Structure formats: C-alpha cells, structure tokens
Design a protein around this ligand. Structure first.
Ligand SMILES: [Cl-]
Ligand SMILES: [Cl-]
Ligand SMILES: [Cl-]
Ligand SMILES: [Cl-]
Ligand SMILES: [Cl-]
Ligand SMILES: [Cl-]
Ligand SMILES: [Cl-]
Ligand SMILES: [Cl-]
Ligand SMILES: [Cl-]
Length: 468
C-alpha cells in the first residue's frame, strides 16, 4: 500500500508561494527569553540582572536568538517567566516587568507549576479562513511534514489535495473542505507540539472530534482520517441538495440549557446542536422557527447569530446520512486511549487513560446526530483540577467559549492557550504557545525552540555559556 505523493499542482503552488514569500519585508522574529528560579524573589533579580546586561554594549551586540539559546540551557526552575521579544528594547521592558512583578502583554510569570496537565481542545466550525496554515506550512519543516502526511491520506480517501487548498489563495473553503483541512491543521499543530516535547493530559472535541481521537490514541491517523472524510463529504453533499422547506438553519442564542427547555415549548421543531457555554446554545431547525427564536432573543436583549449553512448538524436532518456513514466507516479499529477524553458526544463524561475504546462507528453516528455537550465537558475538566486549556485551531473561536465555562465554575485564573490566528504571524503564534506551556510547567523542551549552536556566536556571554 503506497500512498499518493504531493501533486504537481501543489508543487507548482509551493514554488509560487515561496517566491512571493522570498520577496516580502523580513520581519523581526519573536524570540522567547526564559528565566527561572526556585524562589520568585531570585527569578526577579535574575530578570533584572539580565536586563542590566542587555542594556550594556556587549548585550546590545548579542542577538536575541543567542541570548534565548543561552537562557534555554539553564536549569528550569519551579518559578518561571518568559519575555516574548522582537528586539532588545522589547526584551528589556519585559524583563523589567518580570522583575517588578508587574505584567504586560508579551510576558508570562508564575510562582510555580500548575497542578494538572493541559486539556487539548479540538473545535473547528467558525475557525476557517482563506490562508489558514499556509504560512506555517512554508516556514516549518515539521508542520509541513504532517500536513503532507494528512494530504496523502485524504487524497487516498476522497481524491483531492488539501495542500492544494492551503497553498492556493484563490480557493476558499466549504462545508466539506473546511473539515478535512482543519483536521489536517489540527493534526500537524499537535504533532509539532509533540515534537517540542508537549503532550495532552486530556482532549476535548467540538469536526475536531476526529483529531481528538487521534491525539487520545483512540484511532490511528488513518482511521481518524476516515472518520473526518466520511462525515465531511456526506454533510457537504447533503447540504448542497437542500432548498426551500428542506433547509434547516443553525444559530447561536444566549439561552442556557434550562432556558432552552422553557423557550422550546413555543418552537416544536427546534433542537440543540451545541451546548457551547453556560448561557450560549447553538440551536437548529426550520427557518421560520429559527428566525422566531432569534427575534425573541433580540427582544429580550440576548445575543443571537444566524450561521451560514442550509443544513443543521446535530439535528434530525442528519438521519438520511447515518446509513452511508455506517457503511463507509466499517473496518476502523478503535483503541484504548493513552490520555483522558472528555467526550462531548457522551454528555461531557470522562474516559480515563487505559479505559475501554469509545471510537467505534456508532460513536461517529451518535456524534453527527446528537447534541454536543461542550460546556459540560469543560465544566467536568475544571471540576477535576484542569486549568490549562490549549486550542488547536486556525483561529481561537472555542477558547472564548471555554472562558465562559471556566469563569462560571469559579475558575477566574484559567490558562487559555491559543495556537494560530488570522492576521497573526503563524510562527510567532507557535512560539507564544510553546512559551506558555513552558512557563506553567507543562512538558515542553524549551531547548528545542532554538537550532543547535554551530559556533560561539550562537551563545551570549551569560551563564551557562560564558566565554572562558
Ligand atoms: Cl542554572
Ligand atoms: Cl531544567
Ligand atoms: Cl526549582
Ligand atoms: Cl502571567
Ligand atoms: Cl524549520
Ligand atoms: Cl460528574
Ligand atoms: Cl480562581
Ligand atoms: Cl490565559
Ligand atoms: Cl538544529
């Protein structure tokens, strides 16, 4: 079984993307400067001493990258900080805040490690944008390798290339391609994180469920790819054949689950697609009923947003698809998860590492057909000690929902770590992500954020690489 390679057209598009890339104003890269100590008091002094030095002409003459590399080789203590800086001025200002115990947008500082490992959040719909993943694909060999990996599997399964979609600026995403391309971006972002030493304590999903199965060791990459391919082409083909009274809209309204139970007595065909947050629910059903609940919400001063789809996932309109989905997913091999799963399919309940497999065919049918218990899964994570939530996405849509649920459960302090975002540099974003994992004491080998020194100019004249 030999997989499709990268397509001619993908190679052509890459050649063009690389030329366009080579001819742009080069930006200062974002460099992470880590400082740590057993005591916060010492960390703060270390930050101040580093600043003083970076102000000196010898400091000024050393590159941020050589300083960060040197800093990366120190003992990483329990009290930690990172200044994300593009130049010496930014680094110093940030180091000053660290020392002063003050805060600033490019600075993370904490007295000790968070107690529990991070929850990886794999959402999806709403996160897509035309150029998503393109810049990181061109600029990161590891990310690129994983995108190409998923690209082969998706070619093999559906007969087109997601890499073509990523590189081609004229192409935009639909119900089908959004799913498989975000999947690809999710897989590649996570493997990139794993490459730098990170891992999930648990996963939660809102597709994102396919990727979450992969990263939880519930399915092989192949089987996760089948899960997303099968689901996505069926939904895209179904939604395109929908016109008139067949249409079913989806919309976001500021009603709690309890509110919805009362409100729905007036709207007999509405269903819940997603419990997104304590007072935010995605509802679905016939257009006249969706507009009426929207109107009722707007009149009560509650937020309400109609989505763009002629179809309603997680409603009864999915019934015709379940047959095909069943047939198509026959053969998949559900495995025992290797990290925890908050399953938004199974009402937000938790499956332990080593537990029984969950990711059988019936799970994907159940998932497509029934409500997504997102806020419930998040609430269950908070209540079991989790404070770090890290969203693998092209745009951080789900973190805004996560914050509502964490706040509502009495966690005012949560560590909400995004990955990529539109109109934010993708390499910078990932530096920031990995910086933050480091500062909170999660697994992250900060040494791997710099290339191996080839000479002494790759170090700065500070401990532990002082020039004898
Ligand atoms: Cl040290
Ligand atoms: Cl260390
Ligand atoms: Cl320590
Ligand atoms: Cl902080
Ligand atoms: Cl690279
Ligand atoms: Cl519970
Ligand atoms: Cl708190
Ligand atoms: Cl945060
Ligand atoms: Cl290297």
């Amino acid at each position: 079984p030999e997989l499709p390679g990268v397509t001619e057209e993908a190679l052509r598009l890459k050649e063009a993307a690389l030329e366009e890339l080579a001819a742009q104003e080069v930006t200062a890269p974002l460099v992470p400067l880590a400082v740590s100590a057993f005591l916060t008091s010492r960390k703060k002094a270390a930050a101040a001493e580093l600043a003083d030095w970076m102000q000196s002409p010898e400091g000024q003459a050393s590159s941020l990258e050589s300083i960060g590399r040197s800093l990366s080789r120190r003992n990483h203590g329990r009290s930690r900080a990172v200044v994300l800086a593009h130049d010496h001025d930014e680094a110093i200002k940030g180091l000053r805040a660290v020392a002063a115990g003050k805060q600033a947008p490019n600075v993370f500082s904490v007295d000790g490690p968070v107690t529990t490992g991070p929850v990886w959040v794999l959402a999806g719909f709403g996160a897509q944008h035309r150029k998503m993943g393109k810049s990181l694909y061109l600029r990161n060999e590891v990310f690129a390798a994983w995108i190409e990996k998923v690209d082969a599997l998706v070619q093999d399964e559906l007969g087109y290339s997601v890499l073509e979609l990523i590189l081609d600026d004229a192409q935009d995403y639909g119900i089908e391609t959004t799913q498989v391309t975000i999947f690809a971006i999710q897989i590649a972002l996570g493997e990139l994180l794993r490459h730098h030493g990170a891992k999930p304590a648990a996963v939660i999903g809102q597709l994102g469920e396919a990727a979450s199965a992969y990263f939880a060791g519930g399915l092989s990459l192949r089987d996760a790819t089948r899960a997303i391919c099968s689901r996505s082409h069926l939904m895209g083909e179904g939604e395109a054949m929908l016109f008139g009274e067949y249409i079913r809209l989806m919309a976001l309204v500021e009603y709690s689950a309890d509110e919805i139970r009362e409100v729905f007595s007036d709207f007999p065909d509405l269903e819940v697609c997603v419990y997104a947050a304590p007072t935010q629910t995605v509802i679905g059903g016939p257009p006249e009923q969706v507009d009426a609940i929207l109107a009722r919400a707007e009149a009560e001063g509650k937020f309400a947003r109609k989505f763009a789809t002629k179809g309603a996932s997680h409603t009864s309109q999915m019934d015709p698809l379940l047959g095909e989905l069943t047939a198509e997913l026959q053969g998949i091999k559900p495995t025992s998860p290797t990290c925890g799963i908050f399953s938004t399919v199974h009402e937000g309940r938790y499956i332990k590492p080593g537990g029984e497999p969950i990711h059988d065919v019936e799970y994907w049918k159940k998932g497509l057909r029934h409500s997504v218990y997102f806020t419930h899964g998040i609430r269950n994570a908070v209540d079991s000690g989790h404070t770090t939530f890290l969203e693998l996405a092209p745009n951080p849509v789900a973190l805004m929902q996560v914050a509502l649920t964490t706040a509502d459960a009495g966690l005012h302090d949560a560590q909400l770590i995004p990955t990529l975002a539109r109109k934010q540099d993708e390499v910078s974003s990932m530096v920031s992500t990995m910086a933050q994992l480091y500062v909170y004491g999660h697994d992250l080998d900060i040494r791997t954020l710099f290339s191996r020194a080839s000479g002494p100019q790759d170090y700065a004249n500070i401990p532990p690489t002082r020039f004898k």
